[PDB]
Design an enzyme around this catalytic site. Structure first.
Site, PDB file in Angstrom:
ATOM      1  N   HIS A 138       0.805  -1.221   0.000  1.00 31.09           N
ATOM      2  CA  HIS A 138       0.000   0.000   0.000  1.00 31.09           C
ATOM      3  C   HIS A 138       0.838   1.271   0.000  1.00 31.09           C
ATOM      4  O   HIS A 138       0.253   2.358  -0.081  1.00 31.09           O
ATOM      5  CB  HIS A 138      -1.016   0.017   1.158  1.00 31.09           C
ATOM      6  N   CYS A 169       3.943   1.211   9.400  1.00 33.25           N
ATOM      7  CA  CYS A 169       3.809   0.052   8.524  1.00 33.25           C
ATOM      8  C   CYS A 169       5.162  -0.343   7.947  1.00 33.25           C
ATOM      9  O   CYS A 169       6.039   0.497   7.716  1.00 33.25           O
ATOM     10  CB  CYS A 169       2.808   0.322   7.398  1.00 33.25           C
ATOM     11  N   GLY A 172       2.759   5.727   9.977  1.00 31.36           N
ATOM     12  CA  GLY A 172       4.128   5.566   9.521  1.00 31.36           C
ATOM     13  C   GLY A 172       4.841   4.325  10.015  1.00 31.36           C
ATOM     14  O   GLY A 172       5.999   4.095   9.633  1.00 31.36           O
TER      15      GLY A 172
HETATM   16  C1  LIG Z   1       0.719   2.114   8.010  1.00 30.90           C
HETATM   17  O1  LIG Z   1       1.770   2.878   8.638  1.00 30.90           O
HETATM   18  C2  LIG Z   1      -0.580   2.281   8.800  1.00 30.90           C
HETATM   19  C3  LIG Z   1      -0.407   1.817  10.258  1.00 30.90           C
HETATM   20  C4  LIG Z   1      -1.625   2.196  11.114  1.00 30.90           C
HETATM   21  C5  LIG Z   1      -1.794   3.705  11.255  1.00 30.90           C
HETATM   22  C6  LIG Z   1      -2.328   3.926  12.675  1.00 30.90           C
HETATM   23  N1  LIG Z   1      -1.972   2.710  13.383  1.00 30.90           N
HETATM   24  C7  LIG Z   1      -1.555   1.752  12.553  1.00 30.90           C
HETATM   25  O2  LIG Z   1      -1.176   0.652  12.898  1.00 30.90           O
HETATM   26  N2  LIG Z   1      -1.629   1.536   8.102  1.00 30.90           N
HETATM   27  C8  LIG Z   1      -2.711   2.170   7.671  1.00 30.90           C
HETATM   28  O3  LIG Z   1      -2.873   3.366   7.841  1.00 30.90           O
HETATM   29  C9  LIG Z   1      -3.773   1.396   6.948  1.00 30.90           C
HETATM   30  C10 LIG Z   1      -3.637   1.619   5.442  1.00 30.90           C
HETATM   31  C11 LIG Z   1      -4.299   0.509   4.604  1.00 30.90           C
HETATM   32  C12 LIG Z   1      -4.039   0.761   3.126  1.00 30.90           C
HETATM   33  C13 LIG Z   1      -3.701  -0.839   4.953  1.00 30.90           C
HETATM   34  C14 LIG Z   1      -5.807   0.439   4.811  1.00 30.90           C
HETATM   35  N3  LIG Z   1      -5.051   1.913   7.382  1.00 30.90           N
HETATM   36  C15 LIG Z   1      -5.556   1.526   8.553  1.00 30.90           C
HETATM   37  O4  LIG Z   1      -4.898   0.884   9.355  1.00 30.90           O
HETATM   38  C16 LIG Z   1      -6.954   1.857   8.920  1.00 30.90           C
HETATM   39  C17 LIG Z   1      -7.869   2.625   8.197  1.00 30.90           C
HETATM   40  C18 LIG Z   1      -9.031   2.585   9.039  1.00 30.90           C
HETATM   41  C19 LIG Z   1     -10.293   3.136   8.880  1.00 30.90           C
HETATM   42  O5  LIG Z   1     -10.533   3.900   7.782  1.00 30.90           O
HETATM   43  C20 LIG Z   1     -10.310   5.294   8.011  1.00 30.90           C
HETATM   44  C21 LIG Z   1     -11.286   2.980   9.850  1.00 30.90           C
HETATM   45  C22 LIG Z   1     -11.024   2.223  10.987  1.00 30.90           C
HETATM   46  C23 LIG Z   1      -9.767   1.658  11.144  1.00 30.90           C
HETATM   47  C24 LIG Z   1      -8.790   1.848  10.174  1.00 30.90           C
HETATM   48  N4  LIG Z   1      -7.523   1.421  10.062  1.00 30.90           N
END
Ligand SMILES: *[C@H](O)[C@H](C[C@@H]1CCNC1=O)NC(=O)[C@H](CC(C)(C)C)NC(=O)c1cc2c(OC)cccc2[nH]1
Ligand SMILES: *[C@H](O)[C@H](C[C@@H]1CCNC1=O)NC(=O)[C@H](CC(C)(C)C)NC(=O)c1cc2c(OC)cccc2[nH]1
Lengths: 306, 306
Positions: free
Chosen positions: B41, B145, B143
């Site tokens: 991603h 990930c 950040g």
């Molecule tokens: C990558 O660094 C990041 C790590 C998370 C950010 C906050 N805590 C984490 O562990 N991953 C990330 O942002 C995900 C991106 C993908 C493309 C995998 C979806 N997004 C999420 O973890 C995420 C998105 C949401 C939403 O949508 C807004 C709703 C509830 C939970 C959630 N988690």
């Protein structure tokens, strides 16, 4: 989100760990530049150890008596000297992996990472607090002496602890890196007891703020209390007094959450008088006191180190 | 003595951590030999992320679109390919710090160390279990990930986890290093819930044995129980069933302490039906289930790693 007991990355310290063998005793040493630091009781044997005289014992020693073992490479000792309860073994090679470092002595209530080591080889890493009674609740077996505790500030390793001994209650005592014990302990096999401990109040409040930051809010309340009224409750529960400086340090966490420090104190007061009623806070059924305000901000904000 | 939640020394992994930037997204990558592994991603932007098509998105990418950043040295990407939910970026330099390693997938109930990283720089290290529902209760911010989980076996690093996402309950989901998610999760921003968890029974029993090894005996009793009678109690308390293989694995701890596995089960049964009555076990007011039998033997015996 999430909140874990988090240690510093240990790599900078792993490159300093060596094995020190003298006679029948093997322990860990810390190799910075051309000096190896280790507990002075390496020069002892099992009957020396009842009541040693280390100055007498050390003048009887030779450089070649000290086998310093850095991985699979032997370091030649070219000088030795005692500094309080640590030995300084001068070696003919500077450690090419020496990080930027400092020798700092910490305060009870402050935390640090411990790299547990056996035979010069790192075993595990974990986070510890210096208790108000100058012990630490660690995890240490025979041969772990000379393992060090430390913090890392950007790229600089602040060494604060060298391990020397276990007390009869299963807690641990050691020195700073200048060889001065934390608390009223000596590196002798005599009757030594820890002394009564207290709970680190400012840290509990920090951890309650970490809980709020992470969505645990059930313990919050509309009440408040004065600093003096809170401290009367702290005394009764063997929590240490809360000072205005502690209130100041908790300011940033107060501002991020919108919960006044004294309002959180009112929540702690009710938790102390009522317990938790079968509920948990950040996965704990106890009030946790080994996270400093700094630890909470660091984890809940994402500071790194290079 | 003492018992702590202990992570592996992180140094071998710290030397593999790099920063990967594509477009507006920065995350962590894992640099082994001449490949950098990172979550796919990274090729996304905030509106790609509602329901991506990563194959479409990746063919639109160029090698030069990927800025790989190893400390203060930039790595030239010379090829890229997708393996399930991870990207493999082929770089023109092999990592001189590559340890012996393996890519292994772990089982729920098994533990591992997480090196939390931001911008390619390690932030902290902690120990996690893979929950029965394939989540992990970690500590992760924006950040993080591409941070990895791992075990170390003598000198070999077994990578088992790459971080990808946080669920709405504040728990974390990710992949093995072949890019296959643990559990029924996808790397999309859609409505995803963890699924009901259970307590890892065999680990609780291991931790009770660690307690006995460390002098906590108050929960012991003269009663015993059958495996079938215990499992009826486990069901009622949402503990997972105990198998004869679990009994076998607990054999060494049983032998060291002299407490039959089924006798310890009788103690767990009473702890479940009665609670702890205001007492603690190894400093916890909860029954802890994130220590495996191996973790207990490792810590209570002193295994190291080179
Ligand atoms: C990558 O660094 C990041 C790590 C998370 C950010 C906050 N805590 C984490 O562990 N991953 C990330 O942002 C995900 C991106 C993908 C493309 C995998 C979806 N997004 C999420 O973890 C995420 C998105 C949401 C939403 O949508 C807004 C709703 C509830 C939970 C959630 N988690
Ligand atoms: C050094 O590796 C070792 C570390 C301890 C061994 C077990 N757990 C430890 O943390 N330190 C050590 O053995 C001490 C040696 C000196 C010379 C400092 C005394 N000894 C003790 O920690 C020790 C000795 C005793 C005794 O006497 C037998 C009674 C109660 C407690 C105790 N602790």
């Amino acid at each position: 989100s999430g909140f874990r007991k988090m240690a510093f990355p240990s790599g900078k310290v792993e490159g300093c760990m060596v094995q020190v063998t003298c006679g029948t005793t093997t322990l860990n040493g810390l190799w910075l530049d051309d000096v190896v630091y280790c507990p002075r009781h390496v020069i002892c044997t099992s009957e020396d150890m009842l009541n040693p005289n280390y100055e007498d014992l050390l003048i009887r020693k030779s450089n070649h008596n000290f086998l310093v073992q850095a991985g699979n490479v032997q370091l030649r000792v070219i000088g030795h000297s005692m500094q309080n309860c640590v030995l300084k073994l001068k070696v003919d090679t500077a450690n090419p992996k020496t990080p930027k470092y400092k020798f700092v002595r910490i305060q009870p209530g402050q935390t640090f990472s411990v790299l547990a080591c056996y035979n010069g080889s790192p075993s595990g890493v974990y986070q510890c607090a210096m208790r108000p009674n100058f012990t630490i609740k660690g995890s240490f077996l025979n041969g772990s002496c000379g393992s060090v505790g430390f913090n890392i500030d950007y790229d600089c390793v602040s060494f604060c602890y060298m391990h020397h001994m276990e007390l009869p209650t299963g807690v641990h005592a050691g020195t700073d890196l200048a060889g001065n014990f934390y608390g009223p302990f000596v590196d002798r096999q005599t009757a030594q007891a820890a002394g009564t401990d207290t709970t680190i109040t400012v840290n509990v409040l920090a951890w309650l703020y970490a809980a709020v930051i992470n969505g645990d809010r059930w313990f919050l309340n509309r009440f408040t209390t004065t600093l003096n009224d809170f401290n009367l409750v702290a005394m009764k529960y063997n929590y240490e007094p809360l000072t205005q400086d502690h209130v100041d340090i908790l300011g940033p966490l107060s501002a991020q959450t919108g919960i006044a420090v004294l309002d959180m104190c009112a929540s702690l007061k009710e938790l102390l008088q009522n317990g938790m009623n079968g509920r948990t806070i950040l996965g704990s059924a106890l009030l946790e006191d080994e996270f400093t305000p700094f630890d909470v901000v660091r984890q809940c904000s994402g500071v790194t180190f290079q």
